[PDB]
Amino acid sequence: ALTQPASVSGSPGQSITISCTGTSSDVGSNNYVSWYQQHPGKAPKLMIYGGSNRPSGVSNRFSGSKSGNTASLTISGLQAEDEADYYCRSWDSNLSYSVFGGGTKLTVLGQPKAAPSVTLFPPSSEELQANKATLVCLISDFYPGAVTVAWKADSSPVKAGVETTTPSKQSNNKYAASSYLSLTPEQWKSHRSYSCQVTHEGSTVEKTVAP
Amino acid sequence: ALTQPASVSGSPGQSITISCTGTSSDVGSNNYVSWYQQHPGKAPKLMIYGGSNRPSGVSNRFSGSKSGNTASLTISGLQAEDEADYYCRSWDSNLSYSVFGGGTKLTVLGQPKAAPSVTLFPPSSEELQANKATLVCLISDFYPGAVTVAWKADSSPVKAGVETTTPSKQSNNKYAASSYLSLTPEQWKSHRSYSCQVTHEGSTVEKTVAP
Amino acid sequence: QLVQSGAEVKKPGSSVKVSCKASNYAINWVRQAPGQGLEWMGNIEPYFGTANYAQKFQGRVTITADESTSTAYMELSSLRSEDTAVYYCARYFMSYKHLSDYWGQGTLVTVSSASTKGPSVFPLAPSSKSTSGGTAALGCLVKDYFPEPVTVSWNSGALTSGVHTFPAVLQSSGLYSLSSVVTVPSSSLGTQTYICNVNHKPSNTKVDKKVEP
Amino acid sequence: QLVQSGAEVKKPGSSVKVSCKASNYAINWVRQAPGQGLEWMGNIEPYFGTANYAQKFQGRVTITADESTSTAYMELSSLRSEDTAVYYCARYFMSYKHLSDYWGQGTLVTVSSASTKGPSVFPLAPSSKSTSGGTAALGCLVKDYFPEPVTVSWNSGALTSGVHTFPAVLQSSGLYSLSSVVTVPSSSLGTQTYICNVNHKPSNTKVDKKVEP
Numbered sequence: 001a002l003t004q005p006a007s008v009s010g011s012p013g014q015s016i017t018i019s020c021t022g023t024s025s026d027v028g029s030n031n032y033v034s035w036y037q038q039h040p041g042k043a044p045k046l047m048i049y050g051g052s053n054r055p056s057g058v059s060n061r062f063s064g065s066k067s068g069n070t071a072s073l074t075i076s077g078l079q080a081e082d083e084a085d086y087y088c089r090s091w092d093s094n095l096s097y098s099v100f101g102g103g104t105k106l107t108v109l110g111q112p113k114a115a116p117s118v119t120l121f122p123p124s125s126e127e128l129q130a131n132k133a134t135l136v137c138l139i140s141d142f143y144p145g146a147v148t149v150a151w152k153a154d155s156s157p158v159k160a161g162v163e164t165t166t167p168s169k170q171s172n173n174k175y176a177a178s179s180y181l182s183l184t185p186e187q188w189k190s191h192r193s194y195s196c197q198v199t200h201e202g203s204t205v206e207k208t209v210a211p
Numbered sequence: 212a213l214t215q216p217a218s219v220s221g222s223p224g225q226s227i228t229i230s231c232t233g234t235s236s237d238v239g240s241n242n243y244v245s246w247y248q249q250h251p252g253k254a255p256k257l258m259i260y261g262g263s264n265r266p267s268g269v270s271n272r273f274s275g276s277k278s279g280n281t282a283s284l285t286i287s288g289l290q291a292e293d294e295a296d297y298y299c300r301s302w303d304s305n306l307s308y309s310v311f312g313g314g315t316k317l318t319v320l321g322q323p324k325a326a327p328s329v330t331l332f333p334p335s336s337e338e339l340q341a342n343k344a345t346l347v348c349l350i351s352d353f354y355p356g357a358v359t360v361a362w363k364a365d366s367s368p369v370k371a372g373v374e375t376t377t378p379s380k381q382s383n384n385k386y387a388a389s390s391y392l393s394l395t396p397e398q399w400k401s402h403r404s405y406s407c408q409v410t411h412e413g414s415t416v417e418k419t420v421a422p
Numbered sequence: 423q424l425v426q427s428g429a430e431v432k433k434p435g436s437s438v439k440v441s442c443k444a445s446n447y448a449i450n451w452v453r454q455a456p457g458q459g460l461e462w463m464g465n466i467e468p469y470f471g472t473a474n475y476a477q478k479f480q481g482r483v484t485i486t487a488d489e490s491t492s493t494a495y496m497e498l499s500s501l502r503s504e505d506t507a508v509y510y511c512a513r514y515f516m517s518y519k520h521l522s523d524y525w526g527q528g529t530l531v532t533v534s535s536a537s538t539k540g541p542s543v544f545p546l547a548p549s550s551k552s553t554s555g556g557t558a559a560l561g562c563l564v565k566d567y568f569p570e571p572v573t574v575s576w577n578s579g580a581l582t583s584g585v586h587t588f589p590a591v592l593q594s595s596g597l598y599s600l601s602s603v604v605t606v607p608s609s610s611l612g613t614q615t616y617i618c619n620v621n622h623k624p625s626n627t628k629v630d631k632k633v634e635p
Numbered sequence: 636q637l638v639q640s641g642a643e644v645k646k647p648g649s650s651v652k653v654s655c656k657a658s659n660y661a662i663n664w665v666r667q668a669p670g671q672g673l674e675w676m677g678n679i680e681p682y683f684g685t686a687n688y689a690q691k692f693q694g695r696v697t698i699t700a701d702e703s704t705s706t707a708y709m710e711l712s713s714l715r716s717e718d719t720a721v722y723y724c725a726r727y728f729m730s731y732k733h734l735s736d737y738w739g740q741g742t743l744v745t746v747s748s749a750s751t752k753g754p755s756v757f758p759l760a761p762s763s764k765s766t767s768g769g770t771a772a773l774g775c776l777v778k779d780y781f782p783e784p785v786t787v788s789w790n791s792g793a794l795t796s797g798v799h800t801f802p803a804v805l806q807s808s809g810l811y812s813l814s815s816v817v818t819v820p821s822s823s824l825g826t827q828t829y830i831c832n833v834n835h836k837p838s839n840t841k842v843d844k845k846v847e848p
């Protein structure tokens with residue numbers, strides 16, 4: 001098996017290297033070792049092959065190396081877009097058998113803080129006829145990916161029926177999350193209004209809708 | 212250009228490494244580096260490719276490595292048959308341009324000393340009719356490759372007309388050489404006999420022929 | 423270049439056949455359980471039919487090729503819940519004398535005894551007099567389906583920009599819900615057509631919803 | 636797998652066309668001056684006809700391909716004496732998913748204004764009552780030729796073992812001489828046939844000499 005660190009972090013401009021340590025009986029037996037980059041929700045992309053070669057089009061900021069029984073990926077002039085998972089890969093000399101490394105989450109520090117924008121949709125007529133009602137709160141474009149969400153029936157807090165996603169990384173390095181409030185049509189039509197409250201850091205954004 | 216040592220020597224059983232130093236702009240830019248073996252009078256043979264991979268059938272005693280901007284061939288359990296010239300080779304990343312290293316003469320010490328066997332042919336009738344005469348002395352199977360050769364007309368030394376090759380390595384690591392005596396048919400038929408004398412170290416082998 | 427089949431749901435202990443549609447190197451199969459790292463399974467060579475397996479999956483995985491259609495099949499039996507992963511095919515190829523390997527889009531196989539449920543699609547419309555800025559958000563609530571994934575396109579793909587399809591929430595009930603929004607110019611709000619196209623392969627449901635008008 | 640043309644002699648400033656007869660990678664050309672190291676010249680791709688040259692030979696070297704016969708030509712003009720080398724073609728190929736590159740047997744191009752001279756072949760026979768040991772040495776004196784190389788086979792190749800063809804001497808006169816011997820069983824000495832086949836491509840001389848009987 002191939003050991004990589006679970007995660008590494010660096011600053012823009014600096015270089016970092018991710019190590020891929022194996023044995024004399026694999027990584028140190030040939031240089032059929034490669035590196036893959038994976039951004040969120042995407043297939044892995046080949047960055048380095050044969051230890052040190054770049055596929056066509058791949059940036060030259062990505063280099064490969066191999067001291068002893070451990071491979072090494074080095075990213076220079078680190079940029080925000082480099083933020084992703086990195087996997088190393090070995091083949092046996094006979095090229096009949098391959099294995100991947102653990103994976104490494106590369107994070108690029110100094111990303112600017114961003115307040116979320118919120119969209120709140122009321123239940124549609126269509127759903128109201130199905131004798132149901134969902135309020136949809138859409139939280140997008142925030143960083144760091146930590147929010148707390150609070151629903152209000154009028155201005156009374158409502159905890160029951162809330163369903164909130166874990167925030168997950170969009171493809172611009174900012175986060176998105178959603179929060180769903182379930183209630184019954186009567187429950188929806190009895191209150192004067194409902195509000196989804198997104199608090200991020202020093203920020204509170206509240207959006208509010210009405211029957 | 213790629214610098215290798217002009218020659219290296221090792222003992223049977225030990226390992227040696229031949230270095231191939233280039234620049235960041237070639238050897239250290241990718242690992243399209245390879246090693247070639249050349250035995251006397253033969254085409255170069257690929258031993259190592261992509262820095263560390265063996266072609267099919269190539270012995271596993273041959274390994275490759277690359278610290279910094281210098282490639283390295285390592286031969287383990289060194290054997291007599293490894294005695295040959297070694298060349299390293301680089302390609303550019305775009306694979307449109309290649310260069311070779313200087314070459315390295317690998318010599319394996321402790322080869323057993325061997326006395327030469329000698330064959331001496333007299334002029335043929337055919338040549339004698341062409342009004343010429345050559346005596347052919349064939350010196351084969353000796354080591355180390357140093358001999359001195361002395362021709363005799365009767366037992367008087369004869370220096371004029373002698374033509375002797377530099378000894379050169381046979382494909383068993385032993386040396387061969389030849390020596391040619393030119394004389395006129397009358398010159399050949401007047402003396403009682405002619406002899407080619409091969410002295411190797413403590414050894415003198417003399418062969419002798421007659422009209 | 424590489425096209426695999428749609429996503430699937432399997433009861434634990436069932437069989438799953440996933441195909442890959444396609445240089446002559448092997449057709450490799452790599453899996454990734456969600457949140458996990460990549461994992462090699464095996465490969466196949468279109469001629470001679472020689473197949474290789476990682477020791478782990480050996481026996482209970484059959485990778486096959488059909489040259490008549492240049493298509494490869496990975497079968498996995500004795501399906502256990504922890505088999506739940508994205509399954510890719512991958513194949514190496516040579517362009518610039520240089521290397522590249524094409525990956526399939528991947529197919530998600532979820533293993534659970536929980537029933538498959540196709541989604542309900544509700545339109546998410548703004549009050550018209552709700553949106554400020556020459557710009558408006560509208561969407562589709564894709565509610566109460568199982569298992570993942572769901573695919574949302576707008577106007578059959580013709581509309582592609584300003585389109586944000588959010589990751590699903592797993593509700594307490596054990597069903598997923600997810601939402602897709604388009605931001606659209608506000609002036610043409612109730613006149614332009616906005617249809618969302620929902621696809622949930624595991625139950626073979628397709629739903630088209632006219633959000634506007 | 637790879638066959639190049641015979642060796643040649645050229646006056647300084649003449650032209651030399653050397654061919655190579657043949658996986659689809661480039662056909663490379665590598666030279667080695669005698670006693671010198673290897674040296675890359677350039678290569679060619681059979682389709683599109685794209686050719687690459689090392690800066691050194693650039694301009695005065697034309698490498699061409701003829702797909703009709705899968706054959707490649709390296710031409711070198713402005714031939715100077717120091718061009719004297721063995722010229723190989725080489726080409727990469729893929730077997731075990733593994734690499735190998737086939738080299739041509741090489742062709743020697745000697746550059747000199749010294750006249751070409753085909754060899755004289757004389758038989759080297761033992762006195763019959765000369766040789767002791769159920770074994771006897773006989774051969775061919777290949778005398779007074781220019782330039783290198785010369786090729787000696789025995790009985791058209793049928794006889795291959797116990798055959799020692801010695802490196803040439805460069806005589807004071809500026810001509811080469813060389814010798815080939817067979818060791819043969821002594822009993823059948825004057826009854827068995829031993830013919831040596833001499834080939835000296837640079838002058839297009841072939842000589843067959845019956846050494847016995």
Ligand SMILES: CC(/C=C/C=C1/N(CCS(=O)(=O)O)c2ccc(S(=O)(=O)O)cc2C1(C)C)=C\C=C\C1=[N+](CCS(=O)(=O)O)c2ccc(S(=O)(=O)O)cc2C1(C)C
Pocket residue numbers: 031032033034048049050051089090091095096242243244245259260261262300301302306307447448449450465513514519520521660661662663678727732733
């Ligand atoms: C093809 C290759 C490496 C392949 C590696 C593989 N690998 C190893 C992959 S990795 O090394 O781990 O990234 C494979 C693994 C699996 C499979 S499977 O899917 O079938 O199971 C297949 C493969 C590959 C693709 C065979 C290297 C080629 C190097 C070349 N080189 C570089 C040669 S060297 O590195 O300097 O020796 C080269 C130079 C020149 C010229 S030319 O100008 O004369 O035409 C041509 C070439 C070449 C293109 C032959």
